[PDB]
Amino acid sequence: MASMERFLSVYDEVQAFLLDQLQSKYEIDPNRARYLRIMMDTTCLGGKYFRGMTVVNVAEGFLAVTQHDEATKERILHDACVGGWMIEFLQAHYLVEDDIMDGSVMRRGKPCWYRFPGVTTQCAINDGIILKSWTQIMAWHYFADRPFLKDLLCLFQKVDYATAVGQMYDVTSMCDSNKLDPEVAQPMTTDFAEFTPAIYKRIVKYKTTFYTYLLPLVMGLLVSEAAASVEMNLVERVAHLIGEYFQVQDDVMDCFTPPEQLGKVGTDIEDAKCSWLAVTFLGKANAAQVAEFKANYGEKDPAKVAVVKRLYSKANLQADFAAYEAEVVREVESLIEQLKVKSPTFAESVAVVWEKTHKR
Amino acid sequence: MASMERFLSVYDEVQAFLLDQLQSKYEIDPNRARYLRIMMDTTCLGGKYFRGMTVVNVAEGFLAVTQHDEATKERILHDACVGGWMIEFLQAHYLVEDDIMDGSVMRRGKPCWYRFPGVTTQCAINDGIILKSWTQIMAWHYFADRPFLKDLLCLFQKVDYATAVGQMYDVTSMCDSNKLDPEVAQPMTTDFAEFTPAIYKRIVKYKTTFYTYLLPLVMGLLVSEAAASVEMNLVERVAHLIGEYFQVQDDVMDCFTPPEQLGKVGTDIEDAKCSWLAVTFLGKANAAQVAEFKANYGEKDPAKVAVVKRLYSKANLQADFAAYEAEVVREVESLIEQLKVKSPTFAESVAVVWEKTHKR
């Protein structure tokens, strides 16, 4: 089948397995099963499935150059699809919880899950917990007999933990580190001294890159029994590089993409987030521009938000972005060349991942 | 050492390991490390450590009757302490998140974690996520070389999933099942037809008993390499029985124990929870009493809450509780007798667990 058709068919199988198990072993009743089916569909479906399909595409690459029985090819592709859905459900977990944490209104043009009338925060926090628990159920069920079960569970845990740490870095990025204290309400920074490239890079590395690029690439290697055939330090370096670029694109879109196309209203400015735009602006502003940014950033007032967007346009951050992009292109191509030494097939899969990222 | 002294010493070791790893591998800075240290202390310490100490006590029982080198005894006890802290951190996760979900005010006489001024819900949801992630970090680190790693991780996952399902059952227990729908705000039941013993038993089994009694008992067996030496169906039956009694005690205390001793104000009546008191009251009420309960249950109005408490006293639910307790005593003693067939040592550990529960 087309890879996407196989991936979506496996969703139906995994959902049926999870819901049937709830009936047979957890005494669930049909109405709560229906609630959870709708929750799964609403939180897990409707995106592009980039992360899950990366697992599939990596596995397909190795299948084309490795001798296998037909039944083994089918097993590997089925495993890649389940593993990809583990990542999609993990993402669903972090979007449900982050939308609650951030007080978000919309996502993908629909209300955030916790805002559905019959859900509410009381249920939605636990729904997000269940989403992540489902990732572990699918691994222990589908991969019970597999040689890579241990490495895959270990990786998944490390990536999940990194991502939770990243969320902490993200939501505290507008506070002075020396003022962080559970006992004291957290004031917004006034000097913005921690709005630097290195600190931004730290936030993004943990909050996004591990689960968006490192986990799908390595899971593809694991279900293919091909990890020995790559230099893991290069996989990490290229995942963190492409992942950062992905997030910079998202940062720019939050500010400048119309809500209709964006699927939501961006509020990074009002939320005083350490965005690529803010960091890059502060890296080239003169004193008067820095002062005007400070006087307006992180406030809900729409005229103050408009001031900040005006500063960004006046500062020609398009030029900085094109320079950033050119450098990422140089570095990603270099890492892909290095990947070819041990694994030309994996290098081409990484090239495909970059192309999809770059021309999005 | 006294078992408790060893258990608390291992907390310091585990905390140091987790925080040092955040420095060495996650680029954490000292102020965020301090925040997380306070979060850990505030959410994990201050209880009686009943669940974690059960692991230790089960392991101690087997040590007394099994030939081991001294270094192996120390290893087993250290493993039991780490495993016990995994359960204590798991509980900490579900208390942080449940307090947010339920809008709780106090716990153990202190503000709920999310209500600390420098925390807020935005941070506290993610802090609870981190608490559970820490359970997995400690398992993969401390038990990396152990034969029971796989079984322990598998058990932990199944117990965590059961508990999340239980929370869903708990927070939806005042809604008619046929009206559950994400699209429609959930009305409180008017007939209370789902306030039955069997439905109550289902809620409690999943929401509490798996992590409070089954997980500590089986983890004690696993770190002792002694699970083959017991009939697992009896361990499950006795865990679910003692766990239910534990929750019934908690239900009664929420209504009748003074806030000073309780550590909080109970709001089960206002929250329309399917409590043992409500179910038992409806199991003996006459028509006029049922009508008065319906007219007053699940409302914040303090005079309506007082009406409900008056109905409970007038109905002499003390008598039903003493009858319930007598039956649990009969059944637990019977299961302990059965446990002696294969494992007299484990049976005595279960007897200790019951005694601590019963005379609380």
Ligand SMILES: Cn1c(=O)c2c(ncn2C)n(C)c1=O
């Ligand atoms: C409108 N607009 C953009 O659309 C944009 C941008 N930087 C990148 N993009 C895409 N800047 C600074 C901008 O003003």
Ligand SMILES: Cn1c(=O)c2c(ncn2C)n(C)c1=O
């Ligand atoms: C005051 N009170 C109690 O203290 C109590 C109880 N049932 C059990 N207990 C302990 N009932 C019904 C009660 O009215």
